[PDB]
Design an enzyme around this catalytic site. Structure first.
Site, short mmCIF file in Angstrom:
data_model
loop_
_atom_site.label_atom_id
_atom_site.label_comp_id
_atom_site.label_asym_id
_atom_site.label_seq_id
_atom_site.Cartn_x
_atom_site.Cartn_y
_atom_site.Cartn_z
N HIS A 22 0.87 -1.17 0.00
CA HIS A 22 0.00 0.00 0.00
C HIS A 22 0.91 1.22 0.00
O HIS A 22 1.92 1.21 0.70
CB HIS A 22 -0.96 0.02 1.19
CG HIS A 22 -1.76 -1.24 1.30
ND1 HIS A 22 -3.03 -1.38 0.83
CD2 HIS A 22 -1.41 -2.44 1.86
CE1 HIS A 22 -3.46 -2.63 1.09
NE2 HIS A 22 -2.48 -3.31 1.70
N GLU A 68 -0.85 1.86 6.03
CA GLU A 68 -2.18 1.57 6.58
C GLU A 68 -2.13 1.73 8.10
O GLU A 68 -2.84 2.53 8.72
CB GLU A 68 -2.65 0.20 6.11
CG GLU A 68 -2.75 0.14 4.61
CD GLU A 68 -3.80 -0.78 4.14
OE1 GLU A 68 -3.67 -1.98 4.45
OE2 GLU A 68 -4.72 -0.36 3.48
N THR A 123 -8.72 -4.67 3.00
CA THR A 123 -9.54 -4.41 1.84
C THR A 123 -10.75 -5.32 1.85
O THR A 123 -10.73 -6.34 2.53
CB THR A 123 -8.80 -4.61 0.52
OG1 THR A 123 -8.57 -5.97 0.22
CG2 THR A 123 -7.46 -3.96 0.50
C1 LIG Z 1 -8.63 -14.03 -2.08
C2 LIG Z 1 -7.78 -13.19 -1.09
O1 LIG Z 1 -8.57 -12.04 -0.82
C3 LIG Z 1 -8.05 -11.02 -0.01
C4 LIG Z 1 -8.85 -9.89 0.17
C5 LIG Z 1 -8.45 -8.83 0.94
C6 LIG Z 1 -7.14 -8.93 1.49
N1 LIG Z 1 -6.59 -7.90 2.27
C7 LIG Z 1 -5.36 -8.27 2.64
S1 LIG Z 1 -4.40 -7.20 3.69
N2 LIG Z 1 -4.25 -5.76 2.97
O2 LIG Z 1 -3.13 -7.88 3.71
O3 LIG Z 1 -5.14 -7.12 4.95
S2 LIG Z 1 -4.86 -9.75 2.10
C8 LIG Z 1 -6.33 -10.01 1.30
C9 LIG Z 1 -6.74 -11.13 0.53
ZN LIG Z 2 -2.49 -5.21 2.44
#
Ligand SMILES: CCOc1ccc2nc(S(N)(=O)=O)sc2c1
Ligand SMILES: [Zn+2]
Length: 257
Positions: A93, A103, A196
């Protein structure tokens, strides 16, 4: 649907993903004066010697480097964790300016970017099942500040022109994620969520205290990526971070001080 703009950004996500207003959302501000030193927390064990990177992908929200997670290769264990967590991908990010982009924040300080190394709890057999469990994922967060270049990052920066737009991927083998780590593995940890959509509360967060240094040129190359697909109006991939969410009842623990 969702993204990082005025019309579809973080303030809107709760309408499709009501857990956005949950009790365990991430990221948070790490108040270093309220975090509790926990002398019983173990050193983190980061075991990336056998990591097998496969590919790099622009997914329209970030870019991600993916690994072969079909055997116990690159794993995180110890620290606050109970089992073994396998590395599946990392991503970043970052901001439109060097003064924003992370974040998590530390005493309200924002860093230029944040690296997330995403791991899944092998007791759940695959990443998709782990994403549905309260202790399914462990994300190792590392802050980036602008200063000296990070040599271990350069192989990533140099391939980004080949994945400019959403949906582009490129082979990305033999990348060693050990080159993205700071010297110290001192950390804070707390229970939280994906940052996300779908914002599921499935993450044990482990945020390293020591930032890595990257050069202004390295982060500038992140900001040349596009959120859009090829052939659509150009929208630079910048400010792809969620702001800090309320801590609620939670305690942040420190492995040090
Ligand atoms: C299929 C996998 O989907 C997702 C969706 C959102 C998501 N956010 C992160 S984070 N920014 O590392 O909290 S890893 C992740 C994996
Ligand atoms: Zn992330």
């Amino acid at each position: 649907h969702w993204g990082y703009g005025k019309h579809n950004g973080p303030e809107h996500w709760h309408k499709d993903f009501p857990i956005a207003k949950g009790e365990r959302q991430s990221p948070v501000d790490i108040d270093t004066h309220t975090a509790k030193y926990d002398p019983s927390l173990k050193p983190l064990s980061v075991s990336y010697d056998q990591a097998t990177s496969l590919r790099i992908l622009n997914n329209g929200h970030t870019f991600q480097v993916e690994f072969d997670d079909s055997q116990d290769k690159a794993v995180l264990k110890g620290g606050p964790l109970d089992g073994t967590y396998r590395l599946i991908q990392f991503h970043f990010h970052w901001g439109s300016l060097d003064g924003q982009g992370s974040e998590h924040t530390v005493d309200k300080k924002k860093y230029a970017a944040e690296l997330h190394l995403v791991h899944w709890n092998t007791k759940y057999g695959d990443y998709g099942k782990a994403q549905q469990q309260p202790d399914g994922l462990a994300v190792l967060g590392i802050f980036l500040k602008v200063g000296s270049a990070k040599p271990g990052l350069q192989k990533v920066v140099d391939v980004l022109d080949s994945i400019k737009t959403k949906g582009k991927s490129a082979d990305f083998t033999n990348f060693d994620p050990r080159g993205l780590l700071p010297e110290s593995l001192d950390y804070w940890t707390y229970p939280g969520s994906l940052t996300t959509p779908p914002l599921t509360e499935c993450v044990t967060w482990i945020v390293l205290k020591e930032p890595i240094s990257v050069s202004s040129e390295q982060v500038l190359k992140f900001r040349k990526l596009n959120f859009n697909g090829e052939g659509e109006p150009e929208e630079l991939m910048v400010d792809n971070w969620r702001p800090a969410q309320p801590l609620k009842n939670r305690q942040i623990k420190a492995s040090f001080k």
